Design a protein around this ligand. Structure first.
Ligand SMILES: CCCCCCCCCCCCCC(=O)O
Length: 133
């Protein structure tokens, strides 16, 4: 089920991330730095617990979760959210809820690349990651 997502991934393309960040209320200076950062995302499993690390020169995060079980999360931009990650149509779908707002972080594999689609409000960002050996 989740196995093809596992490993270490590097950002190689980003579209509309500033629009996504601005929709979330991220301040201009953080957006500026974020627009020039290329994170590494590491996805690992131990039994049915997944751990997703996002590492960069700017912010680092780490979450652990069971698919289909809600968890508390504090995002890179400091939102305290209620989250769930599931597998839907072969895509790893991460839904965050806070203050009646929602955002989705959808990951799918296309030609071996990991495409992350971020949606909040009307903003839709697509970020492409490529697998590291
Ligand atoms: C990684 C620097 C971004 C920091 C500030 C904006 C955070 C927005 C929410 C998380 C976005 C994750 C994007 C990704 O994993 O490529």
């Amino acid at each position: 089920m989740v196995d093809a997502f596992l490993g270490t991934w590097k950002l190689v393309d980003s579209k509309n991330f500033d629009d996504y960040m601005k929709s979330l209320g991220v301040g201009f200076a953080t957006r500026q730095v974020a627009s020039m950062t290329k994170p590494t995302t590491i996805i690992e499993k131990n039994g049915d617990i997944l751990t997703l690390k996002t590492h960069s020169t700017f912010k680092n995060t780490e979450i652990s979760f069971k698919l289909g079980v809600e968890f508390d999360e504090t995002t890179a931009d400091d939102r305290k959210v209620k989250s769930i990650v599931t597998l839907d149509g072969g895509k790893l779908v991460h839904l965050q809820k806070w203050d009646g707002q929602e955002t989705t972080l959808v990951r799918e594999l296309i030609d071996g690349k990991l495409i992350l689609t971020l949606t909040h409000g009307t903003a839709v960002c697509t970020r492409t990651y490529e697998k590291e050996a």
